Symmetry: D2
Subunit: 334 residues, 4 copies
């Protein structure tokens, strides 16, 4: 009587989603894993992780499956999309995490192959409902067959933006994310058609990049439509990012009142989504942290009673994968 999912794309997100499913003993049953390489190599990448340490030492690859005691997850290596056997496997939700099927027309092919629902682990183009846990996820409708979990940056900015919005109101906001390197970057200078800068050596450079997170916050928080914009800098760390939010609030307030508002949210409405800290934290302190947004109280500054610069950390890998598991469990219960 549990939820049957498959993971399409066993990458950073796909593998860590399975890790988080196992780490919490979720009732979700992972039925199949699809990627481009054989299961023995995927099992290796699942067991060994340069960022998050080793996992499941007893996990083994046997007979085309990932064997973990009695749990057996079927490995697949199909690229034609239409040849995925979701009808035979009775797939409830496809976790679409390849990074290549962000268009709704592309994601709809999983539905044609027998899947009942599709969860895109990235911002999606087209009429795709997008949810951020703790912000607008209760707006999920059982009739939505293709949904998105937004980006990791949106999951960091949106909760903070909601606390500021509900408590003080927002007039204007300009956001910067100092972002860890991701798989789309290059080890040495190479070509990247969509963004030339992104092909430059990932660990030699601070790399400016665009982001849609600020506009995305305007979708799950419609009162913020047209009030936020942003940019990004890619920097040589392998994981963990930070949001730098410069905001003009609608009401006069103090930095203490903002801290108290975020602290109160982290203990109530934003429980397990936002975290509030006053420690002298650095990025590596958040490797493995599962919150969407960790408010850095000592880092922020106030210019006057309406202009502030606020700092919020996030493990762009683990925090996002955990939100995927949270959203899946919410969809099963609705």
């Amino acid at each position: 009587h549990h939820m049957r999912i498959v993971i399409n794309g066993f990458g950073r997100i796909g593998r860590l989603v399975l890790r988080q499913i196992l780490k919490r003993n979720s009732p979700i049953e992972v039925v199949a894993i699809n990627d481009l390489v054989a299961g023995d190599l995927l099992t290796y990448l699942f067991k060994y992780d340069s960022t998050h340490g080793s996992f499941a030492p007893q996990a083994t690859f046997s007979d085309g499956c990932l064997v973990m005691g009695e749990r057996k997850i079927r490995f697949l290596a199909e690229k034609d999309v239409q040849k995925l056997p979701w009808k035979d496997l009775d797939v409830d939700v496809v976790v679409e995490s390849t990074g290549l099927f962000v268009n709704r027309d592309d994601a709809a092919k999983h539905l044609d192959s027998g899947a009942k629902r599709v969860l895109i682990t990235a911002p999606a183009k087209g009429d795709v409902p997008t949810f951020v846990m703790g912000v607008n996820h209760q707006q999920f409708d059982p009739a939505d067959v293709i949904i998105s979990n937004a980006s990791c940056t949106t999951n960091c900015l949106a909760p903070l933006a909601k606390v500021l919005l509900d408590n003080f109101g927002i007039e204007e906001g300009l956001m910067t994310t100092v972002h860890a390197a991701t798989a789309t970057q290059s080890v040495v200078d190479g070509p990247s058609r969509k963004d030339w800068r992104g092909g430059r050596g990932a660990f030699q450079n601070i790399i400016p990049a665009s982001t849609g997170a600020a506009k995305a916050v305007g979708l799950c928080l419609p009162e913020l439509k047209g009030k936020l914009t942003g940019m990004a800098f890619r920097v040589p760390v392998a994981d963990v990012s930070v949001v730098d939010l410069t905001v003009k609030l609608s009401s006069a307030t103090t930095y203490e009142a903002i801290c108290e508002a975020v602290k109160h949210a982290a203990n109530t409405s934003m429980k397990n989504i936002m975290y509030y800290t006053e420690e002298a934290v650095v990025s590596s302190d958040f490797i493995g942290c599962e919150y969407s947004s960790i408010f850095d109280a000592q880092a922020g500054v106030a210019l006057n009673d309406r202009f502030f610069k606020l700092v919020a950390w996030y493990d762009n890998e683990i925090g996002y994968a955990t939100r995927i598991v949270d959203l899946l469990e919410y969809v099963q219960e609705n």
Copy 2:
């Protein structure tokens, strides 16, 4: 009568100051070099540089001097300040680049040892006039015996702030600098009494840090007093930093008009101080660049006709060292 200077602290700044003096064939004569290690080791660090490449292959250390053809610079290794022979060497300006004499009372010890003037290559505490080339350096008075060149970050933000001030006015400004690692940081987690986060491993972490640039810009541009605030993030690159300036202007404008104002300033009032580019630049492209502030036209964003986020690069080593040589030559001419 040429200017006779000495370099106190032959570190990143001290060595690159000598490089830039020689690279331009300046009439400034370096009389002595003071540091904690022998001259043979200092000559080695002068000839080989992990960031800026090898320099002066014919340079050699002989008889306690740095021999470069006919130029001979005396090496010193005194730390008690009071034993430095600046009176016998007829020192016009001491380039104070140890990082330890930022207080005016400490820097005044060079004057007691025979120096006529002291230039602190960092923000200074006390009544020390601070100058930014292209912003307020013409306010230098020959009666000023202890002067400062502000920080590298202030030299990047102040020219951009002046252009914005003169053309559109500034109501509010919130600045973030994504800054390269510097010598005060640590290779692995260690203690840093004044700045706990700064002792964490420099190349494992995004490290939040405070900055005095926003307050310093309010001093050399008094119309911006109380209008600017800022913070910093230290990231794993060995050189080159970038200013992220969120500014609300006093009058409505377009992003194109801002670009045109900076472009024109770089060709006129900010000649050899600011540079304007529209190229797809990343940080390593500015290694060796001598400008104080390089406006990145494609990286910036606009929220509306008064609220913008602007991006300006700087080689925190070479750009600052070049401004030191510029300020010395200006002081010499007045």
Copy 3:
């Protein structure tokens, strides 16, 4: 009764030694911690670690002590050694991990201040017995008041050398260690009187360095005197190193037989000292690993039946700190 120790130098090794004492619930009682800064900063560095994650979340700094439930460790900040109160604190062993008292005459001052024994966490100059767990530690004499645990590299090479010696004999051995960066290195190019190359930017360079491990192995394994030599390369990783041992054995053998010899030792005589793996391991896979020497079976190569190149990993921080605790527990029982 139980052993009372103090940690002189609360650095990478000093903190991880305390961490390893607690992780195994050792009967060793840490009575005092001495370093250069106050206990609140030392507590912060103990709780947060860029390389090994956070630890002891309920640990607090209070009244100049490190409070962990009912365990209370006194914090000290004395550097003059002769003013250290080891007589009043009833100190059995000083864990000397500052890196500054490697000479026996310097370490003997801990005895003059009231300590009964000194364990130097580094190679030591003078008549200091040096021990490698699993190789020669049973040669410890209760009369030895100042002892050494050798280097991290010696603790990796010596166990492997012993297995090769006992099974096949060694005619010649030439060792290279590709070593992680350590606290003696620099973030940017700076002066290093003892080692000019070591002052160059730690994360910009492969940096050649000398090593005493090969000679140190010749002391705890006298049959190898004059048969081993070595060098090192420091590379931009924050932790985990690897030994590259080129060895010509005394008798003909196969690479499979070497693997079986090491694997067999790991299950018996070298239990918890050596580990044997055939996995496709990389350096980060050994972060947190407690073995002194992990044999990388698939990475090594054979030239012929007597000349081999063998690969052995070690977490130079955690592996060595664990051996410190192992040596301390052995000394208590003897």
Copy 4:
């Protein structure tokens, strides 16, 4: 003059063009083939994170790389058979994609009209392999498909030849501590050939195999079966170092080795080997054009026959310079 084309405008392809221009070589680059448009390729040629900016007046215009009066046609064909080497007067195709290392793959350039193909990597099959300063004079004008070996082979082979000619070699085991390359990953990902090579390049020391030791046995047949080796990939963007443990055939001293290498660097190995006694680190060789820089102070001696020797090389610039050197030698022969 000699007319060449560059197939694969990557790290090697671009720096080869950079080295041709830096020396004002008579070689004329007729066309450039890659997967992306010329404007992006022009950008990557002008800006380089490792070796700095170059050719500021260069621009992409009318599908060409324009540099004053030089105009290089840009191509973006992947089907090989659709490359117009017959219409062009192509003398040598610089095969630098990394994907056509087999002779059967390289022979397709000949089918399109090219007169010769130079594979910028170790090649499988009956492909003559040359190392400048070691065996390049064995080049035969009848050789239509040739190889320049690897960057690691170009560092090890000159040192091995000096040791071979002066003292003889009994046995040798080589390790290269190697900079990260384009085949690696920024974060942990799949790599079918070498699983370890897909792990995060700048988080890890990564063991890897190498064929350099066997390749030295080809250009120096007296060393066949006497050398073996391995590699460690480490988090630097450029410059690698060879760690050669060798048993020599005759008793000698470390000073005699240094003097032999120093002597070769001044004569037979001029502009191929360099001899230094400075306190060098890897970044000091960024831009260095020698194939093999002997690090005199880093090496150690065990006895009068067993030594461990250290030789640096810029795996990008040194290799690209040897490509241009080999091309200029082939043109004159």
